[PDB]
């Protein structure tokens, strides 16, 4: 019996974690699950092959090389895609990348903006196929960094701030809109 209130799925002897609600990397579930912070192995276009349905935190996939996003000597790096860490199936990142930018451009809080933009920035780092898209994101990040420093290390004082009160806030959010449109136009 799963202890996650929003799941309560029956577990087995096999399980070191519940497959339905928990991340297959860190073996943790979220209290109020936000699907935009998760990746799921599925058979959606453009990758129709058989999938396992296993899920992980987007952040966990970015942090560990086995997912084929973080460049490593061991794993052939993918461009705009990830390896499901369970079954190995290649899945697309672009849907997730889009979602991060849509939340960023509408964000009122600085920490949301920094966090979401940083994820998009990492997801497509070193891309060849999506260069034009990501160059817009790179421009937005460089602008934001000049005001808050490294996006992942933003101070608590800046974090509680309002995006509109930043000197570059509206400019950065305009760039987020631009990046999403660029993705939509190419695809
Ligand atoms: Zn569960
Ligand atoms: Zn995780
Ligand atoms: Zn899978």
Residue numbers in the entry: 135 to 321
What does the article say, verbatim?
A PHD finger signature is found in plant vernalization (VEL) proteins, which function as accessory factors of the Polycomb system to control flowering in Arabidopsis through an epigenetic silencing mechanism. During vernalization, VEL proteins associate with Polycomb Repressive Complex 2 and are required for epigenetic silencing of the Arabidopsis FLOWERING LOCUS C (FLC). Here, we use structural analysis by X-ray crystallography to show that the VEL PHD finger forms the central module of a larger compact tripartite superdomain that also contains a zinc finger and a four-helix bundle. Our evidence argues for evolution of a divergent function for the PHD superdomain in vernalization that does not involve histone tail decoding.
